[PDB]
Amino acid sequence: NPVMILNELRPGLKYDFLSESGESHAKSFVMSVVVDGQFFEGSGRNKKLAKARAAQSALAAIFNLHLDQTPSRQPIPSEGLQLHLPQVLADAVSRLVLGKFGDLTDNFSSPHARRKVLAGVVMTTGTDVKDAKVISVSTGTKCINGEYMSDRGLALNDCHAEIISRRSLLRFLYTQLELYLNNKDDQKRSIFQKSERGGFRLKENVQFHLYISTSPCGDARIFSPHEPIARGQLRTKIESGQGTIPVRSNASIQTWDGVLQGERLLTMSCSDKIARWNVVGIQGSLLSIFVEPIYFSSIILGSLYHGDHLSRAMYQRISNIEDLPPLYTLNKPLLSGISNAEARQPGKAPNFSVNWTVGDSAIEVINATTGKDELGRASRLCKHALYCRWMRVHGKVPSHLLRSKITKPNVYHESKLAAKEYQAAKARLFTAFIKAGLGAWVEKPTEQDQFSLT
Amino acid sequence: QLHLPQVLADAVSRLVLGKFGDLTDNFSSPHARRKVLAGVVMTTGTDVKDAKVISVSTGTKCINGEYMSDRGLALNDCHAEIISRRSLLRFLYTQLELYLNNKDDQKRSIFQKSERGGFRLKENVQFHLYISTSPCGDARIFSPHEPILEEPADRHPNRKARGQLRTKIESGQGTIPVRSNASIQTWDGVLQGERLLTMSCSDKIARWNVVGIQGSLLSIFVEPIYFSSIILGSLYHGDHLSRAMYQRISNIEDLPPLYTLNKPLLSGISNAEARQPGKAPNFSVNWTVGDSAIEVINATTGKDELGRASRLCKHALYCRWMRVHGKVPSHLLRSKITKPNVYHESKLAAKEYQAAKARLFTAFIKAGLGAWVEKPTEQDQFSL
RNA sequence: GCUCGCGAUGCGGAGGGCUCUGAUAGCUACG
Ligand SMILES: O=P(O)(O)O[C@H]1[C@H](OP(=O)(O)O)[C@@H](OP(=O)(O)O)[C@H](OP(=O)(O)O)[C@@H](OP(=O)(O)O)[C@H]1OP(=O)(O)O
Ligand SMILES: O=P(O)(O)O[C@H]1[C@H](OP(=O)(O)O)[C@@H](OP(=O)(O)O)[C@H](OP(=O)(O)O)[C@@H](OP(=O)(O)O)[C@H]1OP(=O)(O)O
Ligand SMILES: [Zn+2]
Ligand SMILES: [Zn+2]
């Protein structure tokens, strides 16, 4: 027990009750202790657990760590140890994401903070804790239903939270480029530099770290969390709320006018999409035609972390990949849970994907099941708007800086196909997953990318 | 003594009570704290003397969503009558191993080789289910209280909610209908807070009334075994129970042979079991005949108080099944279907039982009564 | 006979807070 040992070691101790929240199931408590002058805190649905986590924090800092379930450890990053310690980094990103989300919901008061899954991207420029800047914040645990998909790319396909935070990341990255391609003094303010290998790369020691409030659906979550000691397949999401199911690598694919008869559009799980990001980067197709591939250095799970299954889900299950294009590589980022893991909350999921990016005034609330915003308007994150920002970029970029020949863009899918190298790394990932025996990525019909800014 | 239904009813109630008290220090053990008793007794001849208690259990609760095991070590449903059947399965494997011990011993087993292949029950042996109350789902929900004998009976038999398959629902009161909009749960989804669905006990007892009570693994050895009577200690409503046990699905057809729509005797006792005051215990005790003493499982974890798996979980029973399998000649098998030694698959080797299950499933679907709700199949894939 | 909507009175597994009793294991002070 933590409070037992903490109150025998420093018996002259007094804990403090800060605030509460929620009602019914939803109820969250923060308790803060101060032992030897140093302050600590912890969180849980009842007061005794919040105090227990504060006591655990005090113990692990001042004295030492308690007898720990070893799967709750952390795989270290690919090449280096350069942003403080893994658990301290992870706790930092948890607090930062929660902080900005509080700001965006008027300190968790606003009706849109009633979320089931929180995700965020944070950016680190260096070792100092002061170089931390929250890049985007997102919630949501649902997806567009088939009959609300737009052939014009004005409706959001996948509103799962971590996905929405990646798309917000993309907005931030495009704006970073808009900053670079203006007053030529603003280029030292940018996050980018001109790549010697042509195009654009990132300044030294600019790291993006991913935080999800839970283990991402799909393969990273298929375990019994109360008994550690197992196939790694691909899974599609399901039309009924949250959850995923395996694929069949040999049968029959779908259509695009098929949400009107029987055999619908499946959407890939979040663990599979995050392995995708760990091979082809996070910039995606169009943005690759501008910048060198970008990967995350860390992944932080606020709950349901397990080192073995997370590791399998993020990179291990595609060890067998080879023939990686230049600048590409299978990304083995930092995996780490947190200390005060969030607790399960039985009940249905929201129909809303709220999102936000640094520089934006307020959040944006999307109806997940329709893929458009609360007032029927297309998002700032759907395919069409991202194409439009990328077109703003293509206009300003000198053509000798491009990473491929796309100086005549008309439609979305063709501009996508203009990334030879990227789509090559894609094809390598797909054959790596098939030859691994795990499945054939469900390719969404091309007919929703057949739009232009026309 | 050739019985009227009451007689046999009051008898089996008496027996299961007495056995329970014997196991719990004459109802003085702290493990006698219960809201729902339920047992199974055997008869071998119409005389109050030669008929004995196979199992007894207690419990009102089901496993938490995040505690379910991919190794078949946790117990999901511990409503007393579900646990009582699982105890009966333990007794059935013991009786098989008694047959398989030697030929002098075969004489005392309740099975015999059967003409169709495999084993069958000896004539004049049969089983009786007792429950202190009515099973959740369709035989209770509409009147969870005693019938006021002034009050006749259900005055809206034809409401669409009569006979619907309903599921227990995690962190929530009551038994929810299915609607044939029966989108099966996922594993990752349940871990992330989607609530865990478990078919209601009247639904399971209808299922045991079409496919027997031995499940698929045991059916690979034994012609299907059905209850003969269902005795309720309280809340007995004849019309609701008769609907929810067999009558719902009297539209069922094309059952595999030896399977049928078993319509057992339903009876209430003479004088009801009285409401137990206090909080409902979160544990469930279980006892099979020929056991040193009770076992006590925490309902919300599906494991005992020290975290060790139960003599009743999927895994324990798969081990029992494997013990008998290794001793049953390939000629005495009721299915010579080879399937890999992993739990889900081994179940699949029971072709006839899976057929009769599918027939029951469409019987419920076609009656307008919704479609069954399987567990995330990720649960049933393991080995030893 | 039902169905759907809206009321109303009731019936049937989670979470949180407090109060009291008992036992356990440590911890002090005291004579
Ligand atoms: O972040 P997501 O919601 O998962 O969206 C992605 C993203 O689509 P957009 O960038 O057009 O919004 C991919 O873009 P790229 O990585 O290629 O840049 C696209 O990839 P494809 O070009 O392979 O189609 C993929 O589509 P798919 O599902 O076919 O892999 C699609 O996923 P969703 O359809 O789930 O939104
Ligand atoms: O009703 P229970 O006593 O809880 O056990 C049953 C039993 O599974 P086990 O005997 O392996 O524990 C069923 O299997 P059979 O005995 O009929 O072969 C299984 O059904 P399936 O075989 O159709 O999977 C069903 O679960 P479900 O129907 O939801 O999958 C499961 O009941 P629980 O789900 O409540 O454990
Ligand atoms: Zn997801
Ligand atoms: Zn029940």
Residue numbers in the entry:
A (entry chain B): 235 to 463, 476 to 700
B (entry chain A): 316 to 699
What does the report in the manuscript say about this coordinate set?
Adenosine Deaminases Acting on RNA (ADARs) are members of a family of RNA editing enzymes that catalyze the conversion of adenosine into inosine in double-stranded RNA (dsRNA). Critical in the mechanism of the ADAR reaction, a loop in the protein (i.e., the base-flipping loop) approaches the site of reaction on the dsRNA from the minor groove and the side chain of a glutamic acid (Glu488) present on this loop flips the targeted A into the active site and fills the vacated space. We identify additional nucleoside analogs that accomplish this in vitro and in cellulo and report a proposed mechanism of action for these analogs based on crystal structures of a truncated homodimer of human ADAR2 bound to dsRNA substrates containing 2′-deoxyinosine or a base-expanded cytidine analog (dyC) paired to the 5′-G.
X-ray crystallography was used to resolve the structure of the ADAR2-R2D E488Q protein bound to an RNA duplex containing a target sequence derived from human glioma-associated oncogene 1 (hGLI1) and a guide oligonucleotide that forms a dI/G pair adjacent to the editing site. To trap the RNA/protein complex for crystallization, we synthesized a duplex substrate containing 8-azaN at the editing site. The dI/G pair adjacent to the edit site is well defined and shows the 5′-G in the syn conformation with its Hoogsteen face accepting hydrogen bond donation from the protonated N1 of dI. The interaction appears to involve a bifurcated hydrogen bond with N1 of dI donating a strong hydrogen bond to N7 of 5′-G and a slightly weaker hydrogen bond to O6. We hypothesize that despite the favorable structural benefits offered by dI at the −1 position, bifurcation of one hydrogen bond may be less stabilizing to the syn:anti pair than the two hydrogen bonds present in the deaza-dA/G substrates.
